[PDB]
Every structure is written in structure tokens, then in C-alpha cells.
């Protein structure tokens, strides 16, 4: 209830660049706090690249804030070295145009991870068009930048990892270990891949396009009945075992006969711990996932979003209103049925489309959670809800509602489609929140009042 | 206190005289009380009896929407003669039958198809001389000429894509909403959806970078769906809304493998039927006949949005004394030809909506006949 909603800071990017598709906090020590914004369709200076995507650094403070792009990669598409000698002419071995670089941006310490889910690449053997996906890992405040493309491997086709689209979702563990989700591996069974920054930097060898990172963790291929499950559509990290290694929470929106399910994979070795199942067909249970302790017990609790769930009004008319499920963890484990469920009110609002822990926004002793409905509100510009934590679990009524201050346009604003909270930009004891509105190429920073 | 009045109560068209009594679709009457007015006292319920009677010879329009992945080539070889066999069959059911055809495979974008030039030119193997992928194509608008359907369906080319699930929901939405371009009449509208695979739905476009939700407008240019790259797949809720709004009755003819998926889809979609299709569509005519009997033998009632303080309830008095209440009370089954059933509709108001002469409508799903209800508040 204490977010400064009467005068938030608005960041603007190039028109049509989807500026604000993903947002993240950045502070590489020395209080140099900054905001990272992804623009998957932005034009860049890379030779021969059309709409390669970009990531913007927007330092906080100094009254107005100017956003400048970061050069993760200044080079164009590589050429097939065989083509240089071949009389047929040079060929690109790689396709960076429309790669959606910056579709997901994450940071931890002075390291930044930005990924390009739509990045494609033709093998060095046969001319395929595999959308493997790629990520760039900035280290020690840009002093070193490494490419990490785990799904660019010897399994080069949709039957293998060719269509993996690694980096479709990603996250950092509290120790800095990288976690990626590829929805496409093995005929869209999906996959989760993880490696440490030390391992990546040790195995780095840029001239080998296919180069396996030693010690990498990944899930195994399964039988054909599991195809089209989209494992890794969304990922999150939390502690759900009796250890100190964060475990991977992954969404599988199309797993069980188009009923979604969310699986928690053991952090130490990537193996299944728990399963949770959706309630309605094609509700996209698992579109978004989050992990945070909402009832103050010190044990992380799980949140899952199903933005396409369909409900019926008392009158009897069916309507599309998303739903969010909360599973409280307890010392004996975590039960397979949700303790609480939150439902949207705006038709076609897609209530459970995004999630983010807010930390203890009001510093009352219980962490809070923000849920975004990109097409809610009277004008369908999108809405973000704030739900307070409590001793009995997450509250059922929002304590605050955030909406765009600007007027509606011909196109949707997608306000609330991307969220990030739990960090403080001012130095106050109160965490802040950043909301993406890529439909209008804007990102909004909300600050928690004392 | 509350009061009730009836303004239009034309009787059902039984045409018991015989076959000489031919009628236009608008002349046939199946719902008896066509108009009412109710005065409501705060907290006082008012009820009336609603009578339905199934007609005998209502016309039928059938649109055949078919998947054209390579696995359906043998299916197409059999669907070739449907334009004659199905009309011969339906002539036992209705005296006026029209048919139409359409096809679909998949969205033509990065993840769902191979985007190399060679594969865009031919998605299958060289021996399997497939044509380029396409989203949706309206081959033949609704017509009563069977030979035209036969020829046009015979001239179609098979295609293919990469991922097993197919993008047929785009085609379903376009067929539902494109109206005049397809020639729907105000008669029994049947949509036969035929395939041998799963289906994409909203949220799958994010993989290909399609984040804009389906708008539900018609986007056909030259009988081709042009915005497949621009709009995401429809959601099941959106399809339910549009199909129920446009009086489309759906028949899912799918192979044995995907019966468990399409049965749940049928449960979700009102006024739809599902049947088991052969490996090469040899029993499709019997599927259609059985599904038509199943659909036409049931009645489901719908009502529009009500004011904030108003509520409604249903009670159905079907054949053989079997009755219902709640969500089950707005439905009857086994309505044979010439059969008659009744419903009890109860309205209540708990507030005073500013003394306005409110109104709303009730109708049976799949028909354009409505019952108009006028609400007035004693305040």
C-alpha cells in the first residue's frame, strides 16, 4: 500500500523495440545501483544484423535517467569457414537477425546474463536452421564477456537439442550458478540446463562453436509420450530440501494431456523432488512460477500462474480469468494441493501471467507478492496487484493496484507483463519494484514509501 | 408486489397437416413465449414456464475443416467423394443441405516450421512432393452443389510442418467469425473439425515471438489467412465465446490416439460432439450422422448478462419425468423430432437498479430464436 504510485519514474526506449520486455536490478558493488531493461527487437550497431535486440543500462539517481545500450557483442554473424575457400561464396554459419537478444535479463553481483531465445544456427555439417538459442555472460562488471550456448551441441535437430531455444527462461541461484530452460529439446519435451560461472569460464573456447562445458547439469531425454510438454517454459530457484543448495522450480505447461504441472528439481543433482498438477485443461498451469516464503516460517513456498483458466460467473456465463495457486511448505514437505488460490476478475485479463517476490514491502515481517494481469483494467492496458503476506499465508485481497498513468493507444500496453522486485534502489530499508510495459516501450520504477 | 405479463406467445409450428406445409427458416417456430415483462419487488422472485418443441425439417449448413499434414493424404483421398456421399445421406435428414471445405496446417514462423529456403519450398521429403506450409485456406464457401465440392477437394495439395501439434484453432476462429465470406445462414450450423494430432493454443506463440493475443476479427484476403504471423493462437475460452456467439455446433472427428484429449475439449466446449475417426477417414459420414443426432437430441439454454442485483435460476422438465435443477436445470436430453419439453425460469432482484426498464434475452444454444424478457423494478 506504500508504493509511490502518484509519481513513478518512467523509462523510455526506441519505438517498436519492445523496450521493457524484461527488467532486472543491477549493482556491481560500490552502490552503483542500476536498472537493466531488455529490448528484444531493438536495432544495434552490429554489421549486417537487423533487429538483433539490445540491453540498456539505466543508472539510478541524478534526477533524469538516460538509458544507454550495452555492447555484449559488437560482431556480426560469423561466416562458415568452409564457405571462405569454397567457390560457391561465403555463407553465414549463424543467424543473429531477429534473435530477440535481451528477451530475458538476469543479474547477480557484478555478473549479467542476457539470452537470445530466437537465435538460430546452421550446423557445420548440414545446412539446418536450428534455433538453439544463446546467452552472453558478463563477468566482473563487463571486464569479460563469455558466450554460453549449452544447447548448441552434437544433437543437432528437433529430434535432439537443435530446437532447444535455450535461454527462453533463466535465473541465478544465490551462489551465482546459471540455470537455463529450453522448451524445445527432444521434440519439445523441454530441458533444464545449469552450470557454474567458474565452469563456464574454465571451459570457454570461443573458436569451437560446439564446446561442452565440463560439469554441466541437465535433465535426461525421455520417451516419446512426453513430447510437447514445454519443460522449462518458466524457471525459478528456491530451497525445497534439507540442504543449502537452491533447487530448481520449472514449469511444464503442456505436460499431462495439456494439463500443466510444475516440477521441483533437486539442486545438487538435477532430479525430480515434487510434482504439482493443474486443474483445468489448457489453462497453461505453469506459465509463470515463483518461490518465496509468504507465511514467515523461513521455508520457501511455491506460486504457480495459470493465466488462461476459465471460470463461470454466478449468472452462468463462462469467462477467461487466470488463476494463481499457492503451496505452503512445511517441515514434513509440501503437500500436492494448493493451500490458496487467487482468481482474476477482468475477462481475458490473464491474471497469473507474471509473478515476483516483493520482499517485505511494508516491513511487517512477512514477504509480499506482486501479480500482473497484462490485459486487465477498464481500458485493457494491464494491471499489477500487490498481495500481502501473513502468518496464515498470502492474503486474499490486494493491498494495492498499479495501473498506467498514460492514456490508452491503438495497441496494448502490456503493462505488468514483466516484473522484478525485492531490491532497494534508494538505500532505504524498503524494496522497490520495476514493471515492464513493452507494448509502449516503457518501464516504470515504483519505490516503497516508509 | 411483483407482477408478470406476456406480450408475444405465438404457438409452435407443428405442420401436422402434412408435407404440404413448407415453411421458411424464419417461419418455423420452436420456442413458444417470445416476449415477457416482469415487475420485481426487492427480494421477490418471479417465474414463468418456457416451452420448446423440436422442428422436423430444419435446413443444415456443414463446413468441413480438414488438417493437411502428410499423414492425412490417405484421408483426403477418401474425403474426395464426401461432396456426393454426405449429401445423399443428409437428404434423409433435411431437404436443404449445403457444404463447404477448408484446410489448415500450421503457423508459418520460425519454431513451428523449418525456415531454410528448401524446406519452405517443400516441408516434406523430396519424394513426398508437399506444398509450402500455410495457416488457413477457405477452399469452398458453403454451397449446395456436391460435384463442385468433389472437384475442388480433389485438386488440393498436401503439406506438412515440423511439430506434431497443429494450428487448427486459428482456422476455427476464422471460420466462426468470417461470416459472409463463408456463407453461413440462420440455420443449423455444423463445423466438422478433422485431424489426427493435438492442437496449439494461446501462449504457444511466445516461442515464435508472437505475443499479441488473437483479436477475433476476420483476416481473410484471397481466401487466405494473412495474420497468422501476427496474432497468437486463440484460447479455448475465446473459442467457446465465439462459437457460442455465432451458433456454431462443432463435431471433433479425431483418430483413436487423441480421443482422451478431445473428449476433455468437448467437455469444455458447449454444444460439441466427438467421434473416433479412422486412419483414412472411411467412417466420417457415420461420425457426422451420429454426432448430428447427438447434438440435435439435446437442448441447452443461454441467457445474457444480468444487472448487478438480478439473479436467475432454471428448472427443466424433460421427457419421462426426468427433471433437473441448477446448472443441470437449463438442459434437456432425448428431445426427439416433434417432442415437447418445458423449463421453469425464476428471476429475482435484491436491489433497485435506478427504476430503469431493464431487459435481457434467453435462447437455446445453436438457434437464432430468442425470448425477450423485460424487467421493471418496484422502487
Amino acid at each position: 500500500f506504500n508504493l509511490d504510485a502518484e509519481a513513478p519514474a518512467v523509462l523510455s526506449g526506441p519505438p517498436g523495440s519492445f523496450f521493457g520486455f524484461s527488467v532486472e536490478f543491477y549493482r556491481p558493488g560500490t552502490d552503483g545501483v542500476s536498472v537493466l531493461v531488455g529490448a528484444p527487437k531493438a536495432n544495434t550497431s552490429q554489421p549486417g544484423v537487423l533487429q538483433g535486440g539490445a540491453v540498456y543500462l539505466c543508472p539510478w539517481g541524478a534526477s533524469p535517467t538516460q538509458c544507454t545500450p550495452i555492447e555484449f557483442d559488437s560482431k556480426g554473424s560469423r561466416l562458415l569457414e568452409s564457405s571462405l575457400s569454397s567457390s560457391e561464396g561465403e555463407e553465414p554459419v549463424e543467424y543473429k537477425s531477429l534473435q530477440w537478444f535481451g528477451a530475458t535479463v538476469r543479474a547477480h553481483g557484478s555478473s549479467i546474463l542476457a539470452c537470445a531465445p530466437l537465435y538460430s544456427w546452421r550446423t557445420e555439417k548440414e545446412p539446418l536452421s536450428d534455433p538453439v538459442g544463446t546467452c552472453y555472460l558478463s563477468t566482473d562488471n563487463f571486464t569479460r564477456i563469455l558466450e554460453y550456448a549449452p544447447c548448441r551441441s552434437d544433437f543437432s535437430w528437433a529430434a535432439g537439442q537443435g530446437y532447444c531455444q535455450g535461454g527462453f527462461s533463466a535465473e541465478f541461484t544465490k551462489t551465482g550458478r546459471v540455470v537455463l530452460g529450453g522448451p524445445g529439446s527432444y521434440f519439445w519435451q523441454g530441458q533444464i540446463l545449469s552450470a557454474t560461472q567458474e565452469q563456464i569460464a574454465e571451459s570457454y573456447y570461443p573458436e569451437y562453436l560446439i564446446n561442452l562445458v565440463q560439469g554441466q547439469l541437465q535433465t535426461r531425454q525421455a520417451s516419446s509420450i512426453y513430447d510437447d510438454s514445454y519443460l522449462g517454459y518458466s524457471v525459478a530457484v528456491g530451497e525445497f530440501s534439507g540442504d543449502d543448495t537452491e533447487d530448481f522450480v520449472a514449469g511444464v505447461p503442456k505436460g499431462n494431456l495439456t494439463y500443466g504441472y510444475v516440477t521441483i528439481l533437486n539442486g545438487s543433482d538435477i532430479r525430480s523432488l515434487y510434482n504439482f498438477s493443474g486443474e483445468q485443461m489448457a489453462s497453461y498451469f505453469g506459465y509463470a512460477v515463483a518461490a518465496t516464503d509468504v507465511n514467515g516460517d523461513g521455508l520457501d513456498d511455491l506460486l504457480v500462474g495459470a493465466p488462461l483458466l476459465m471460470d463461470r460467473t454466478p449468472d452462468g456465463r463462462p469467462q477467461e480469468v487466470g488463476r494463481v495457486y499457492v503451496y505452503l511448505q512445511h517441515p514434513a514437505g509440501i503437500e500436492p494441493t494448493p493451500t490458496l488460490t487467487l482468481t482474476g476478475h477482468d475477462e481475458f485479463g490473464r491474471f497469473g501471467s507474471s509473478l515476483t517476490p516483493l520482499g517485505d514491502l511494508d516491513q511487517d515481517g512477512y514477504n509480499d507478492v506482486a501479480i500482473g494481469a497484462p490485459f486487465g483494467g477498464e481500458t485493457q492496458q494491464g494491471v499489477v496487484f500487490v498481495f500481502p503476506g501473513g502468518p496464515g499465508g498470502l492474503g486474499s485481497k490486494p493491498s494495492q493496484v498499479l495501473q498506467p498513468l498514460w492514456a490508452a493507444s491503438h495497441t496494448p500496453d502490456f503493462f505488468g507483463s514483466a516484473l522484478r522486485g525485492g531490491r532497494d534502489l534508494d538505500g532505504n530499508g524498503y524494496p522497490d519494484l520495476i514493471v515492464g510495459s513493452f507494448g509502449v516501450d516503457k518501464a516504470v520504477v515504483y519505490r516503497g514509501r516508509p | 408486489r411483483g407482477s408478470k405479463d406476456i406480450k408475444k406467445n405465438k404457438n409452435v409450428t407443428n405442420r401436422s397437416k402434412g408435407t404440404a406445409e413448407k415453411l421458411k427458416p424464419e417461419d418455423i417456430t420452436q420456442i413458444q413465449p417470445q416476449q415477457l415483462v416482469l415487475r420485481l419487488r426487492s427480494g421477490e422472485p418471479q417465474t414463468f414456464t418456457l416451452k420448446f418443441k423440436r422442428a422436423e425439417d430444419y435446413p443444415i449448413d456443414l463446413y468441413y475443416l480438414m488438417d493437411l499434414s502428410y499423414s492425412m493424404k490417405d484421408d483426403l483421398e477418401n474425403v474426395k467423394s464426401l461432396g456426393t456421399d454426405l449429401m445423399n445421406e443428409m437428404r434423409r435428414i433435411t431437404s436443404d443441405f449445403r457444404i463447404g471445405f477448408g484446410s489448415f496446417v500450421e503457423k508459418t514462423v520460425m519454431p513451428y516450421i523449418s525456415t531454410t529456403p528448401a524446406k519452405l519450398r517443400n516441408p516434406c521429403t523430396s519424394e513426398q512432393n508437399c506444398t509450402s506450409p500455410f495457416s488457413y485456406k477457405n477452399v469452398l464457401s458453403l454451397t449446395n452443389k456436391g460435384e463442385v465440392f468433389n472437384e475442388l477437394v480433389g485438386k488440393q495439395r498436401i503439406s506438412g510442418n515440423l511439430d506434431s501439434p497443429e494450428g487448427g484453432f486459428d482456422a476455427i476462429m476464422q471460420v466462426a467469425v468470417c461470416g459472409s465470406l463463408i456463407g453461413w445462414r440462420n440455420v443449423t450450423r455444423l463445423l466438422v473439425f478433422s485431424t489426427d494430432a493435438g492442437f496449439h493454443f494461446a501462449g504457444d506463440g511466445k516461442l515464435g515471438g508472437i505475443v499479441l493475443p488473437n483479436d477475433g476479427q476476420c483476416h481473410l484476403e484471397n481466401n487466405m489467412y494473412t495474420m497468422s504471423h501476427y496474432y497468437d493462437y486463440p484460447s479455448i475460452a475465446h473459442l467457446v465465446q465465439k462459437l457460442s456467439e455465432n451458433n456454431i455446433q462443432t463435431i471433433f472427428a479425431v483418430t483413436e490416439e487423441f480421443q482422451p484429449v478431445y473428449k476433455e475439449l468437448k467437455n469444455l466446449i458447449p454444444k460439441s460432439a466427438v467421434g473416433t475417426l479412422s486412419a483414412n477417414s472411411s467412417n466420417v459420414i457415420q461420425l457426422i450422422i451420429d454426432a448430428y443426432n447427438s447434438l440435435s437430441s439435446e437442448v441447452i439454454l443461454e441467457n445474457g448478462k444480468l444487472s448487478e442485483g438480478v439473479t436467475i435460476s432454471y428448472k427443466s422438465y424433460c421427457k419421462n419425468g426426468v427433471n433437473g435443477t441448477g446448472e443441470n436445470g437449463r438442459k434437456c436430453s432425448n428431445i426427439s423430432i416433434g417432442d415437447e419439453v418445458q423449463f421453469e425460469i425464476s428471476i429475482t432482484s435484491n436491489k433497485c437498479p435506478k427504476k430503469d426498464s431493464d431487459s435481457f434475452k434467453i435462447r437455446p444454444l445453436g438457434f437464432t430464436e430468442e425470448v425477450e424478457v423485460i424487467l421493471q423494478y418496484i422502487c
Partner: antibody, heavy 119, light 107 residues
Framework: DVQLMESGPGLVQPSETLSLTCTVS????????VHWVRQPPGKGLEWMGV???????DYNSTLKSRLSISRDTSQNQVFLKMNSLQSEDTTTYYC??????????????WGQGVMVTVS | DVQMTQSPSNLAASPGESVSINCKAS??????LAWYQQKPGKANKLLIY???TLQSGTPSRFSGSGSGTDFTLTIRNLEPEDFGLYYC?????????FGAGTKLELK
């Protein structure tokens, strides 16, 4: 039990077209690529061309104007047609198998080879 | 286009001994090298791929080594059937290229 078997005329005139056949067993041509390799009388192996699993073909740039590769999935047969030349006498031809879509591998199976004389 | 050069054109050894065959590439090819055996009356047989991974039927006395541009094949205890011809193929990039071959004969 994968097996690649090779056949062709043992002796051809310098002007004729040399036609060779590789008959396969234990796998379907639509799942694997079938390559053609030759070993001149006293040299190492040389790659000639490939019949991709999808039905298209690629050839060695030096021989592309002379080569022509085809297949018959019904008969499990892959054909090679070439313009003959004396200077290529007593050269041996091989057909091999490998996968490029999915789990890529080197040439995992070979034929026994056929020796062709030109006079 | 990778040129592969195989060092010993001919080798002489006696059964029970040990030998090594070296194959070198014109450019770094990571670990993607395969070794083959050719007996006079039979087809080529894959022994090792990816530098050091044995094919299922390969006897354990065969071992591969090396990475980058230099690779070597070692036969630990020569049985009389190990004598023949040996080839190295790089499987990193197309078009495929092969070494000239090495012939192993009795001492």
C-alpha cells in the same frame, strides 16, 4: 544388423556413363545419409557426394558437374552416375552411412567397395 | 576444408607388441576424430570416435588419445588379426576428409 552392399559394372569404356548401386539393409534411407567415397589406385579416400536423408543431394565441388546421385526408397537402393575417364582406372568406390539430424556421428558403416576398370 | 595427414605410412610389428599411429589435422578440430580398420576382404570398421570413445564391439586393447590438431591411436597387445589398414576421419565439419592410411605388417 546394418549392412551396405555395393554393385556396379566391373569394366566400362571411357565414353560410357558409370552407374553404381548401393543396396542397404537394417535401416531406412529416410533416416540416414548415404555418402559416396572413392579411393584412387594409390591415394587416400576422397569424398564424392551425399544423398541427404531428406532426398536432396550435395556433391564435391570439383566433381559436381559430372556427378548425379539418386535413390529409390522402395528398393532401399542409392545410385551414382558419373562420366567415365581412363585416368580414373582401377579406382575403388565405397558407400557409407552417417547421421546429421539428431545424434550426429562419423561414417559408422561402410560397404566392401567395388573396383571399376576403364579401358 | 580440413586436410588430415597420417604420419606412419607403414609399420612393422610382431604379435604381443604395442604400436602407435599418429594422425594430424591442418586446423584445430577439438576432439572429433574417428579411427577405422580395414581388413583385406571385409568392409571398413569403426573403432573409435570423438577421439577416445570406443565403438561397442571394439576390443579394449584399442585406445585413442589427443585433441586439437594431434591425435594418436594405440594398440596395446597385437593379436594376429589386428594387422591391416587404419584410417582417421575428422567429423567436425563437412565435407568429410580422411587420412592417407597406415599399413601394419608383421616384423
Amino acid at each position: 544388423d546394418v549392412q551396405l552392399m555395393e554393385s556396379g559394372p566391373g569394366l566400362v569404356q571411357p565414353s560410357e556413363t558409370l552407374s553404381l548401386t548401393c543396396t542397404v539393409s537394417g535401416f531406412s534411407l529416410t533416416s540416414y545419409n548415404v555418402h559416396w567415397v572413392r579411393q584412387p589406385p594409390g591415394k587416400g579416400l576422397e569424398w564424392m557426394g551425399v544423398m541427404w536423408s531428406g532426398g536432396s543431394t550435395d556433391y564435391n565441388s570439383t566433381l559436381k558437374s559430372r556427378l548425379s546421385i539418386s535413390r529409390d526408397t522402395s528398393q532401399n537402393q542409392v545410385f551414382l552416375k558419373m562420366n567415365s575417364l581412363q585416368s580414373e582406372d582401377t579406382t575403388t568406390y565405397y558407400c557409407a552411412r552417417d547421421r546429421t539430424m539428431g545424434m550426429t556421428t562419423p561414417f559408422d558403416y561402410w560397404g566392401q567397395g567395388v573396383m571399376v576398370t576403364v579401358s | 576444408d580440413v586436410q588430415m595427414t597420417q604420419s606412419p605410412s607403414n609399420l612393422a610389428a610382431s604379435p604381443g607388441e604395442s604400436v602407435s599411429i599418429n594422425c594430424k589435422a591442418s586446423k584445430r578440430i577439438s576432439k572429433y576424430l574417428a579411427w577405422y580398420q580395414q581388413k583385406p576382404g571385409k568392409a571398413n570398421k569403426l573403432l573409435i570416435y570423438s577421439g577416445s570413445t570406443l565403438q561397442s564391439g571394439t576390443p579394449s586393447r584399442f585406445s585413442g588419445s589427443g585433441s586439437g590438431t594431434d591425435f594418436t591411436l594405440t594398440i596395446r597387445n597385437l593379436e594376429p588379426e589386428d594387422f591391416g589398414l587404419y584410417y582417421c576421419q575428422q567429423h567436425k565439419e563437412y565435407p568429410p576428409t580422411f587420412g592417407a592410411g597406415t599399413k601394419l605388417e608383421l616384423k
